[PDB]
Design a protein around this ligand. Structure first.
Ligand SMILES: [Co+2]
Ligand SMILES: [Co+2]
Ligand SMILES: [Co+2]
Ligand SMILES: [Co+2]
Lengths: 331, 331
């Protein structure tokens, strides 16, 4: 099949290097803690309770291990609450392996003023590149802990000029270090555009995962993205009807079709769940409860896989999505 | 004249209560430290150097005291680097009095995802109100240090629905506690709209300062805002040509006209300067140097006031803008 080609570093988790064979069943896109841009300004009434967070994240970590999952890829952007040391605490406490990211969110849902300003005054792309390269090769914030992936995100109607600064920096770091790239796509769009842009900039398709692809329910769109040889992730499995997000019945309809067409080696599954919110905990209106009911990280192990198997998906295909694909993409 | 009417608290500075008579010459809108939304995500290559910041801010504080200025109003939004404890260090080290704010930035230049989400799920306005009320009456982040003003900000083409949540919360806190409100207007617009909205919600005009009014060079716009009985601030004096910002020659043209028409009691002056940037220090292209050359907090004392006086402005009018107005607005 398609193996990563070029410069390569051993997978870096918040607790250090891990061999590809030691990754095991992996959730490729989750958030241990997360706060939307602006949460830190609500510090007075929404402070971070370290003790409660640690206890709650370590428990979720344990529940995961209980189900055979050994690794989690935390895709939290630098300004959305990323905290490598905390991730390290959870990991040293449970034995759950956690990789964290380096990257900023999409123009629409991130704090883009900082770099939009630096770009108007100077060379923001090379500044973003230096940040990503330092974080992947040396470490984040002096902690000595390195990012195991680069997180990229684009808007719905287009990969904006602000967003492309990050896409060009990452491609450079990716060619230089071979580090994986995972992405966020907004509202089921830009998947083909993201894969085309990244590969044309020289990023290795075997090290790219276009995310939130479950956000589109027309398989023509998934197939068009897959032609680029990149992997795609149905990664918000469990979040249903929440903000135009589809239902799981819709995601499985598309997923089985793709699996039916031989695409298992490029298909990955995650929930994009938040284990502990930063800021004031989410006030979820009764009427929106069914949309977040299955949005936690045990949902794929307990409800999705058994569902794919009973529908004819093979143990081998399930293993390809959950163990094989992650080992090669991140290992 | 127009005195504040209603509930009132003694002015709160980062080092505690200060009598109106103890405020003295005041710069009503400055930023000791400041980082545009997103700066914290650039923590690896742009960490905060505490020692360098403290030394540099205490020096600027001293330069200010040297010129007779006793107080500074720090208008930094909660998510733009606000740090009351640090402000307290500068103040305890120099004797410079500093008031800090409670508030979020305008939709365009702040991290609005957090509250836009909380608003779609619940009652964001009452959540913002609880934050402001706690910060003004009890303290910020458990430090025991209270905000001395509420900072509000609107966009250029309209005060957006997201922005109005903050405007309605503040008006409520203002009616309840009598705390002052200072604002940011974007690109010379919405001044009359902000004063009309605030007063219609019951906020006391004698406790409201519409900011960045120097951003518009048509005095009809200033006069239309002034009818509401609120104060206005030419508060980015020194920042010239930088992003549509006018020149100081333009600001003085309008200011002398207004002073010529008797408006001294409602006119305030500031620079909106940043004493120490958060994130990576600003890379200012040679070609933009003249736009920021006079953008530091000694510019009004050294160049503006002497300029107004030589143009006929009286010592009394100068004292009204710099000492009288602040004593009543914040005291
Ligand atoms: Co996302
Ligand atoms: Co995510
Ligand atoms: Co402003
Ligand atoms: Co300001």
């Amino acid at each position: 099949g398609d193996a990563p080609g070029g410069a390569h570093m051993t997978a870096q988790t918040v607790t250090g290097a891990v061999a590809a064979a030691q990754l095991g069943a992996t959730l490729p896109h989750e958030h241990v803690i997360f706060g939307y841009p602006g949460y830190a300004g609500d510090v007075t009434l929404g402070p971070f309770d370290h003790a409660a967070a640690l206890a709650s994240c370590t428990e979720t970590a344990r529940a995961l291990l209980a189900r055979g999952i050994q690794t989690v890829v935390d895709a939290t952007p630098n300004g959305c609450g990323r905290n490598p040391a905390f991730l390290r605490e959870v990991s040293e406490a449970t034995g759950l392996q956690i990789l964290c990211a380096t990257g900023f969110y999409y123009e629409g849902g991130g704090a883009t003023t900082y770099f939009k300003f630096r770009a108007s005054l100077g060379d923001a792309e090379s500044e973003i590149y230096e940040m990503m390269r330092t974080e992947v090769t040396e470490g984040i914030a002096g902690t000595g802990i390195r990012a195991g992936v680069i997180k990229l995100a684009s808007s719905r109607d287009a990969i904006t000029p602000y967003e492309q600064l990050f896409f060009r920096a990452a491609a450079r770091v990716q060619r230089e270090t071979g580090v994986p790239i995972i992405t966020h796509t907004q509202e089921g769009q830009q998947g083909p555009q993201q894969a085309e842009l990244l590969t044309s900039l020289g990023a290795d398709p075997a090290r790219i995962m276009i995310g939130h692809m479950d956000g589109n329910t027309d398989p023509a769109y998934h197939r068009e993205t897959l032609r680029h040889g990149v992997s795609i992730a149905f990664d918000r499995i469990g979040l249903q009807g929440m903000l135009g997000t589809p239902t799981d019945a819709e995601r499985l309809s598309v997923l089985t079709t793709l699996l039916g067409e031989g695409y298992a080696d490029r298909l990955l599954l995650s929930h994009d769940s938040i284990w502990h919110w930063l800021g004031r905990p989410p006030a979820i209106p009764e009427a929106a409860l069914p949309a977040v009911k299955d949005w936690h990280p045990l949902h794929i192990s307990d409800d999705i896989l058994p569902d794919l198997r009973r529908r004819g998906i093979t143990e081998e295909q399930v293993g390809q999505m959950t163990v094989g694909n992650p080992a090669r993409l991140f290992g």
